[PDB]
Amino acid sequence: FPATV
Amino acid sequence: FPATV
Amino acid sequence: GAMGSMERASLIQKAKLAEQAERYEDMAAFMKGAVEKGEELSCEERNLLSVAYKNVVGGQRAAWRVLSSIEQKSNEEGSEEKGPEVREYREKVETELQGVCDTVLGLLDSHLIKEAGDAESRVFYLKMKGDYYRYLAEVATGDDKKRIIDSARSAYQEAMDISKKEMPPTNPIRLGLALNFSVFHYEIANSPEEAISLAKTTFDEAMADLHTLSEDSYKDSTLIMQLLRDNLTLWT
Amino acid sequence: GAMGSMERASLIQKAKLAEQAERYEDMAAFMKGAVEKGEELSCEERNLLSVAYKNVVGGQRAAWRVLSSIEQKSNEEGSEEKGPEVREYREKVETELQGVCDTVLGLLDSHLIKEAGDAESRVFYLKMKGDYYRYLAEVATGDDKKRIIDSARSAYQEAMDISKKEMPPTNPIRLGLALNFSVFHYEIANSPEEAISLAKTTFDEAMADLHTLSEDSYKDSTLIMQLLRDNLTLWT
Ligand SMILES: *CC(=O)NCC1CCN(C(=O)C2(Nc3ccc(Cl)cc3)CC2)CC1
Ligand SMILES: *CC(=O)NCC1CCN(C(=O)C2(Nc3ccc(Cl)cc3)CC2)CC1
Ligand SMILES: [Mg+2]
Ligand SMILES: [Mg+2]
Ligand SMILES: [Mg+2]
Ligand SMILES: [Mg+2]
Ligand SMILES: [Mg+2]
Numbered sequence: 001f002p003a004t005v
Numbered sequence: 006f007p008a009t010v
Numbered sequence: 011g012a013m014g015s016m017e018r019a020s021l022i023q024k025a026k027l028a029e030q031a032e033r034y035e036d037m038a039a040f041m042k043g044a045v046e047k048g049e050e051l052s053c054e055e056r057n058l059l060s061v062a063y064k065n066v067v068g069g070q071r072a073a074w075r076v077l078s079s080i081e082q083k084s085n086e087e088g089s090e091e092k093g094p095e096v097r098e099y100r101e102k103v104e105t106e107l108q109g110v111c112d113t114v115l116g117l118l119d120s121h122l123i124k125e126a127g128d129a130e131s132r133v134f135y136l137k138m139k140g141d142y143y144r145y146l147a148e149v150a151t152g153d154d155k156k157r158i159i160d161s162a163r164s165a166y167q168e169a170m171d172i173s174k175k176e177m178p179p180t181n182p183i184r185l186g187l188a189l190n191f192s193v194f195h196y197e198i199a200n201s202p203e204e205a206i207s208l209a210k211t212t213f214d215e216a217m218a219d220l221h222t223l224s225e226d227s228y229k230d231s232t233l234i235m236q237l238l239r240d241n242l243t244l245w246t
Numbered sequence: 247g248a249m250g251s252m253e254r255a256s257l258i259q260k261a262k263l264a265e266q267a268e269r270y271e272d273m274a275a276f277m278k279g280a281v282e283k284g285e286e287l288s289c290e291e292r293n294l295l296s297v298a299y300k301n302v303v304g305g306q307r308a309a310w311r312v313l314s315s316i317e318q319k320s321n322e323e324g325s326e327e328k329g330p331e332v333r334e335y336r337e338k339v340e341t342e343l344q345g346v347c348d349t350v351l352g353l354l355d356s357h358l359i360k361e362a363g364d365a366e367s368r369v370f371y372l373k374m375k376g377d378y379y380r381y382l383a384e385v386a387t388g389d390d391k392k393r394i395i396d397s398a399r400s401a402y403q404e405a406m407d408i409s410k411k412e413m414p415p416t417n418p419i420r421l422g423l424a425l426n427f428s429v430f431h432y433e434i435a436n437s438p439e440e441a442i443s444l445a446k447t448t449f450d451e452a453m454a455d456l457h458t459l460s461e462d463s464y465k466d467s468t469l470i471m472q473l474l475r476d477n478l479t480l481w482t
């Protein structure tokens with residue numbers, strides 16, 4: 001799963 | 006803190 | 011009884027799904043519903059019940075400790091007055107924790123314990139009763155603190171008496187009971203010598219009975235024996 | 247409005263305590279109460295709001311993914327029929343997730359966005375709007391899936407347009423918006439090329455502006471740039 005902020 | 010189960 | 015319309019088997023199935031999803035509040039609610047069907051619990055089911063509530067209350071205890079520490083620091087000399095909010099929020103968490111404990115104790119009293127005749131079930135439930143009174147004792151500061159502590163002690167003692175008569179010294183339930191009662195002595199009853207003696211004797215008597223066990227039983231017993239050792243190491 | 251009787255400042259204080267205690271549901275409820283006082287939020291307060299709901303919904307998304315995986319496996323050939331329970335429990339978690347998203351979107355619409363005039367506040371809220379529509383899109387399977395996806399896209403696009411006009415390429419809000427909009431492209435809009443282009447261009451334009459920054463601003467910007475790089479590495 002990709003990084004989000 | 007000590008171990009409990 | 012929000013779970014009153016759900017099949018017992020479906021509640022058990024969902025408790026297992028909730029565990030896999032790390033949804034411990036859901037898991038506990040499902041298991042409460044299952045208990046309230048009124049049938050006795052199997053071993054697997056007792057473990058689902060205990061895991062669910064242990065995780066819920068464990069999180070509440072950790073939060074309570076964070077908040078209590080902040081509160082204690084606020085009451086030191088040279089701490090600036092910040093108003094009632096820290097105490098209020100610690101009280102909120104505390105009340106929620108007490109509610110969970112009361113819920114569990116309620117399930118045990120109505121009617122898990124009284125229907126539990128086999129040593130493995132009866133000791134397991136009495137241990138739980140001791141544990142949830144212990145959690146109440148951790149946060150108790152009033153008129154009833156002594157009675158709460160005694161309620162924990164009494165439950166653990168009954169469990170101990172049965173376990174010593176009816177179970178081998180390596181039985182994981184007997185071991186876990188002893189581990190937790192030892193912690194009760196150390197942390198709640200201001201009896202570190204009793205705590206240490208109990209842990210040591212329990213460990214040594216289990217060690218002497220390992221020879222009777224299968225590989226799989228050996229694994230189960232040695233796991234809890236290591237917890238006894240860990241606590242002894244912390245305390246000595 | 248269970249928080250209607252509590253002072254704004256007390257809600258903010260308690261949100262901070264809840265964060266320290268890792269009580270993210272409480273933190274979100276406190277921040278909802280603070281928003282509902284009707285005053286604009288400061289930067290620190292916007293971050294408390296976002297952290298609280300990110301943590302709550304993050305946990306729900308992780309649980310939903312576990313349950314959806316189990317459900318998908320149940321629908322494969324040679325899987326034994328286990329009844330409606332997996333779908334029911336996935337639906338329960340899903341409904342709770344949608345409720346949280348709707349709550350956040352509600353705060354943004356009533357009336358955070360319309361009162362936000364400074365670029366840093368407006369972009370931050372529009373990014374949040376994109377994010378919570380994205381979470382709705384992740385679980386959408388019906389008639390409105392396209393409109394939900396478009397709602398996310400529109401919110402992100404408005405935020406992007408403002409950020410490019412009003413903020414330097416290293417601004418952490420501009421970077422985080424681009425990071426998340428890039429993920430939207432990759433995971434939701436079936437546009438991996440757009441995702442990769444956005445991440446790359448954002449990274450490279452930030453790199454070129456690092457020379458203007460203090461040590462502390464450099465730390466903040468490079469942290470998010472590394473997330474852009476991490477995603478590029480995953481995707482290429
Ligand atoms: C029905 C039953 O036999 N339950 C006990 C098992 C024993 C093995 N076990 C463990 O070692 C762990 N949990 C506990 C829980 C309670 C007690 Cl009293 C002992 C051990 C996982 C440590 C799982 C439960
Ligand atoms: C009011 C304000 O300036 N908020 C943004 C800050 C920027 C720095 N920061 C971060 O790097 C982390 N969180 C976020 C959150 C949202 C966005 Cl758009 C970017 C970054 C912690 C990663 C904290 C919030
Ligand atoms: Mg039935
Ligand atoms: Mg109290
Ligand atoms: Mg004795
Ligand atoms: Mg006021
Ligand atoms: Mg649905």
Ligand SMILES: [Mg+2]
Pocket residue numbers: none
């Ligand atoms: Mg573009």
